[PDB]
Amino acid sequence: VADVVFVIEGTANLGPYFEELRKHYLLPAIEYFNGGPPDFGGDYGGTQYSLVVFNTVDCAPESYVQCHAPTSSAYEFVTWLDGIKFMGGGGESCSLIAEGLSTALQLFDDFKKMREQQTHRVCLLICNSPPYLLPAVESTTYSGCTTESLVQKIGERGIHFSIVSPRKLPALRLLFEKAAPPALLEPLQQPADVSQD
Amino acid sequence: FLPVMKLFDLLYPEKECIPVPDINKPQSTHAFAMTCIWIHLNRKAQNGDSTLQIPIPHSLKLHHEFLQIALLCNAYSTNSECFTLPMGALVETIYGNGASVTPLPMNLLDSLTVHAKMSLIHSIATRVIKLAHTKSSVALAPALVETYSRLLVYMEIESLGIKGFISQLLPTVFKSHAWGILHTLLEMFSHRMHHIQPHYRVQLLSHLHTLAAVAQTNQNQLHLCVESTALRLITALGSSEVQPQFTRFLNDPKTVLSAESEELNRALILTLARATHVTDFFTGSDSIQGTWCKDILQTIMNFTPHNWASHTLSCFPAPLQAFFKQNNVPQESRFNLKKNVEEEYRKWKSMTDENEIITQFSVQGFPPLFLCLLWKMLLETDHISQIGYKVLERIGARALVAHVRTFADFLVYEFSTSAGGQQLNKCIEILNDMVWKYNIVTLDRLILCLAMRSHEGNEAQVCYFIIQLLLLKPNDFRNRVSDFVKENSPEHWLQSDWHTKHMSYHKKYPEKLYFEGLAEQVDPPVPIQSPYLPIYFGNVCLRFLPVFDIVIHRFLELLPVSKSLETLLDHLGGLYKFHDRPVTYLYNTLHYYEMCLRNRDHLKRKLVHAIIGSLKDNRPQGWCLSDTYLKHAMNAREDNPWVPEDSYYCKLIGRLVDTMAGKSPGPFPNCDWRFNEFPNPAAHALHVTCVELMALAVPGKDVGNALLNVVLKSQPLVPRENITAWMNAIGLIITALPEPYWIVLHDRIVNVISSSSLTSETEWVGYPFRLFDFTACHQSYSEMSCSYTLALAHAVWHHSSIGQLSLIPKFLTEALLPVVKTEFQLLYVYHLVGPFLQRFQQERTRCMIEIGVAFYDMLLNVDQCSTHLNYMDPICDFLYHMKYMFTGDSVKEQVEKIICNLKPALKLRLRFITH
């Protein structure tokens, strides 16, 4: 139960803004599943989640993914990745991470092998720069596109997925509602933390 | 607790499911530990009302709800909300009732109480004190308090608590008679619990003494038993305990220690003598430190017992009360005998028609005035006439002690004045027979009163036959003690039915003591006085220990007493199943008897087979190798056990060196490491060492040689990698042997080992340092026998460093003088005596000066007999260390009278010793 996924990618595009968003959207979201971030035992408790933030090909010709957050007790490594994510990312502003979200799908896969005995799987991804790229994975067997990623995240599994970007709105939300299963990308609002994004 | 719990869940609970259902009726606490700590941290979170109430009990989720077998009653009541269902799962008091008059038998220790410590601390304590606050409104039904007494770790954690509670209960003497609570437990509390803190137990002894004295006791008629109990606490542990506690009874003798417990005081001073026997607290000084005991003597000089009057003054360390020898005035100047006889005659002729007035006339006890009336009654064919029954029930409650003392004295006088046999037969026929039914003493008090006057000079030679006939009289009660075998050996620690057992016991054998065997005019039976009677008179076994001691350890001159003693245990051996400490009970019996016991030791050849018989009264399955000695000591004992005992000794000391890492902690210790004197199995070693071959001429010299053969000769089993622990154990043993055994050792060491040739030219090995230093045995060479012996000394001096050192100055002053000519012998004796000056600076301050003057005497001797000193600077800085660190500035003058007449070179070398 309560199988959530936390993703952010705008580190290269916009770092400080995330720090602001953390003060209003990221931190309250975690409190929905914990009595308060302190330092506790970690195991297969259902309510665990991951923390995935990477960069683009601009100044990283030797690294795309280094995620590691199986349980983290939802407090310690969560707060760590929040406050110690990154400060890099240059090049230009055309695309930061699309191939990342595909890997995110792969993460859900391991839940099928780990969360045996449903769980109403949920996921959330953040990215300031509007992404677009030809490559798909370059890391694993699975391959596709942004369209393939979203149809997998919606149809293949009923994972509720939203994108709480900065107050600005790019040309992304439009295509991300072409899924017959309700995407529910609504939680991009200055109002307080939604119950389940 | 956060990081501890985190790391525990990480390391220990390394899995991903909820395995191990763990029913485990015998023991499941280990499994449910994780579930319980999770429950406790969740309870703490709920008390804090935060941290999401500590969610995710996943790991042991099943075990999380196991609460919804008596052994599976794991009470987690301590946290919260488990005082209704789990508390009632434990056997509570009895509210339905108010001779099986007590339901709900007791709970077993190992079953549930082994774990429930953090919860059950003062639960029943609050109940019992709340019941005690107002009064004993009803006959106390709960007898489960026995389980309360079967609480060892609980006392270990709340000793101060129960002491405070008892002190707060003490105002019960102002409240109501001080009875309705004290006589409830003070006996069973002291019986069921044997091991306790020494300071705590002496404080309890002091408190009991005060309570006996103050407040008034004339209303507490059954307080007599309370006296007997008080005996055990002062007799069963008096080895080395009273001396450290000297600060805690500095004022108690100043106020009250001699109110009425004169017999208790006598047993006390006997135990004190037994204690101070070790280690030589009377040899050094005469009356300087005697303040430690002289104040005690004050109590004794209030009544001046122990008045042999220069007749058999040999079994004592140093007779100090011997100064107060004239205050005895024995037998009232030999004149008051016929005077008190005529007095009691006149009082009989008067009480013939003055009973209603002699009731109020017989006040103050009048010991040699009243009890002689007994000599009349049952002498005139049951001429009691019940006139004296009221008098005894009214006045003779306490003063009966001096009464029975005079009674014993008078009966011994009558037995002596018989003189020929015209009465002896009549005595054995009627006089010692009528005392059976029905005296209140019940053969309990007469022993010490008989002892107080028996050892006196007057007729010590014939009270022997008195004790003989006295021990021969029991033929109707000893059978009860005989059939009483089936109470201890079956169950002594794991009590499950002892309640009904002792119920049936006190129902069968005893009937009544408060009434007479003959029904007078009116006698309302109304049997109700049975609130708490767990033990009736079995406790006498404690006082049964001095009986032998006072009759064996004190009286040993006439040998046929042996023929007596061998019978006693042969009928009362099984009675010994409550304590086993023969070391402190036998060591004093040979402090100076050996030099004269040799011939009588032949009869000891029988007595050992009696003494070990007392050892035979024990079935814990705790002996598997001493049985070899037993088997090889049952047929033709004068053939086998002489030689091979040496090897046997190794085997024995093997267990000692098997105390640390071997497999001895298996079947050797059992049942239950609680009251079998087991803080360390080492105490089991000293068990037989002395009584092994004390029958023949083996003691004196052969015993010491045998003990030391394990060093100078390479035993087969002896391995050369751990000889250190071996010598350590040998010293541990030696610390518990009589004087000559470990004094002959010193003479053997200094005899030829220090002086083989060693004076003309020993060898090129004459380098002192490499030889005399130990740890050279780490190599298979440089292990010359002599050096070994050195460590040997160190060995015993590694543990006998309390009072035994007072022996070495004398041992020096003569023996080491005319045996040393060269210098390496000096270095040897130095290493022998050297590394112990701290023990003298601390305690034996008077002896360090002698040690120093001995050092300087060795120096003068080696100076006068030498061609030239080869190792000047070693002795120089040695003496420098000794002076600057230990002698301070005291001996400076005396050494001067020696240091001036040394060699010019040595003079310049020690020049700065002048200051």
Swiss-Prot record, chain A:
Signal peptide residues on this chain, from the entry's feature table: none
Keyword Transmembrane attributed: no
Keyword set includes Nuclease: no
Molecular-function GO terms, alphabetical: nuclear retinoic acid receptor binding; nuclear retinoid X receptor binding
GO terms, biological process: positive regulation of transcription by RNA polymerase II; positive regulation of transcription elongation by RNA polymerase II; positive regulation of transcription initiation by RNA polymerase II; RNA polymerase II preinitiation complex assembly; transcription by RNA polymerase II
Family to which the UniProt record says this protein belongs: Belongs to the Mediator complex subunit 25 family.
Protein name from the UniProt record: Mediator of RNA polymerase II transcription subunit 25
Species per Swiss-Prot/TrEMBL record: Mus musculus (Mouse)
Lineage: Eukaryota, Metazoa, Chordata, Craniata, Vertebrata
Curated annotation (Swiss-Prot), chain B:
Family: Belongs to the Mediator complex subunit 23 family.
Any one of the GO BP annotations: positive regulation of T cell extravasation
Subunit structure: Component of the Mediator complex, which is composed of MED1, MED4, MED6, MED7, MED8, MED9, MED10, MED11, MED12, MED13, MED13L, MED14, MED15, MED16, MED17, MED18, MED19, MED20, MED21, MED22, MED23, MED24, MED25, MED26, MED27, MED29, MED30, MED31, CCNC, CDK8 and CDC2L6/CDK11. The MED12, MED13, CCNC and CDK8 subunits form a distinct module termed the CDK8 module. Mediator containing the CDK8 module is less active than Mediator lacking this module in supporting transcriptional activation.
Keyword set includes Transcription: yes
Residues of the full protein shown: 392 to 1334 of 1367
Residues passing through the membrane, by range: none
Record keywords: Activator, Nucleus, Transcription, Transcription regulation
Known role: Component of the Mediator complex, a coactivator involved in the regulated transcription of nearly all RNA polymerase II-dependent genes. Mediator functions as a bridge to convey information from gene-specific regulatory proteins to the basal RNA polymerase II transcription machinery. Mediator is recruited to promoters by direct interactions with regulatory proteins and serves as a scaffold for the assembly of a functional pre-initiation complex with RNA polymerase II and the general transcription factors.
Identification of the protein by name: Mediator of RNA polymerase II transcription subunit 23
Principal location class: nucleus
CC terms in the record's Gene Ontology section: core mediator complex; mediator complex; nucleoplasm; nucleus; transcription regulator complex
N-terminal signal peptide: none
